[PDB]
Amino acid sequence: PMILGYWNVRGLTHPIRLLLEYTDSSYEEKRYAMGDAPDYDRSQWLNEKFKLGLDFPNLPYLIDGSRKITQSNAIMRYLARKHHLCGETEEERIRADIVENQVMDNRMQLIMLCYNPDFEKQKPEFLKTIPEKMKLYSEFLGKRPWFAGDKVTYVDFLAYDILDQYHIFEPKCLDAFPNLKDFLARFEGLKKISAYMKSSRYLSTPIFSKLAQWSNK
Amino acid sequence: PMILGYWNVRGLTHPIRLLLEYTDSSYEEKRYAMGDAPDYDRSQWLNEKFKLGLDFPNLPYLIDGSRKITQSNAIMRYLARKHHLCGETEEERIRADIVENQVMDNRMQLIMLCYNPDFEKQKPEFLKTIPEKMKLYSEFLGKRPWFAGDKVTYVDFLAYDILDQYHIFEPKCLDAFPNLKDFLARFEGLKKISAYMKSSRYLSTPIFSKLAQWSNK
């Protein structure tokens, strides 16, 4: 089977595991335990970082035989092509490309913060920006069932992850956007997702580990 | 024709203009002003940011008829598909997907620094990592003429921008990687490239303007 390499948290892998499962992909996971604090030791990673034959060594990685991939987005695209979950029209391709890029921006923004020693201080002015963040996705999706269109695609995976993460962070963040809650429910409804999601293996959380300001566990 | 919206800067637009030209695109520009120190005023942008009918309001943007694309990479990709500047084989795509993601990471890395209040201190430390970064590009590239393979692709535009920029920051950063040095010369060679670059409407510098801790002009 393929090997998926990542740290011991939800993270950037949330959408990959969700993808793999959805597609019934055959895979094994390769969990990297990060040392504790202070340390936060990454030796277990660092010790093989350059020994896996990775183009630009990183976490997460997917090894599918001779095929060695880094860059979560890359990993995603790779699995999308494999299972045909890319946009089928230019329109769709564009929507997915914007979305893919957009999720990362927002993901990064949150991440940045939860790892900001000075959290508490900014943790409020930050929450000031979420409704706009959310409204963006809201207007975009509009009435479509899926982010690219009528057909589910890989970016739904990313979209799902991101929305869930904000929600989780700011529980009300979605009350104003019913379309967005419908989506969450619709993705959660995909038959292979519900089981997986109720699985012992499955760790809804936490995108973030020990190093975290909000959720250091 | 097509319209391109950006900040008086080079930044994210650099790869875009380069591709726009390469492909002989016919387009107009809508340049916006970034208020100064302090201020760093973007009224205009802000006065209209919400009036363009764009999906995720942002700079830059490219309007091509019905087509309104935000996110620089999406922009890049839309132009790539249009002129067949994408990877053609599965292998070419992976390389492309990887490099693209990799370039942005690296760009952000440098931008974050340039935008850090504690830049002077951070700098030396940041310098220390260059070789490694550079190294991965060099090896990933190996002996290929282009990042994805035998033919120029959009990622070449990404890569050149970024390599050109690290090279200005750390003029020696490349001495140990001649494939890289060739790549730069070779990229600058492309007929339509030299052509545009020689032109009077070409802006190399800088990636960052005002705010910029490094390259504030």
Ligand SMILES: N[C@@H](CCC(=O)N[C@@H](CS[C@@H]1c2ccccc2-c2ccccc2[C@H]1O)C(=O)NCC(=O)O)C(=O)O
């Ligand atoms: N652009 C890349 C980013 C990859 C990334 O930065 N990887 C970090 C982990 S994600 C990173 C993180 C680190 C530790 C713990 C948690 C996280 C995490 C979780 C969720 C979201 C993002 C993060 C980042 O801090 C890493 O540890 N790489 C190993 C290395 O560089 O040698 C991608 O999308 O794959």
Ligand SMILES: N[C@@H](CCC(=O)N[C@@H](CS[C@@H]1c2ccccc2-c2ccccc2[C@H]1O)C(=O)NCC(=O)O)C(=O)O
């Ligand atoms: N992920 C998006 C990034 C878009 C974005 O961050 N754009 C910023 C300007 S570029 C941005 C930047 C901002 C300030 C100063 C410098 C920079 C910069 C300079 C060079 C390269 C990249 C940047 C970005 O950090 C912006 O002003 N958007 C309009 C808005 O805010 O509504 C993309 O790739 O398109």
